[PDB]
Amino acid sequence: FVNQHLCGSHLVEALYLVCGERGFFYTPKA
Amino acid sequence: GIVEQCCASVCSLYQLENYCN
C-alpha cells in the first residue's frame, strides 16, 4: 500500500497504518 | 515535504516513517 502515489486522505491513511500507536504528523505545506 | 515525495512522486516506507512521532 505504501509504494504508490498517495494523496490527501489516501496519504493520511497510509501514515495512520504505518505509524500505529506512535501517531504521525501530516504537514502538507512544510 | 511529504506531498512532493509521496503524492507528486511515488512514496516509500522509508519516507513515511520519517513522519511518525
From Swiss-Prot, chain A:
Q: Which residues form a coiled coil?
A: none
User: In terms of domain of life, where is this protein from?
Assistant: Eukaryota
Q: What is this protein called?
A: Insulin B chain
Source species = Bos taurus (Bovine)
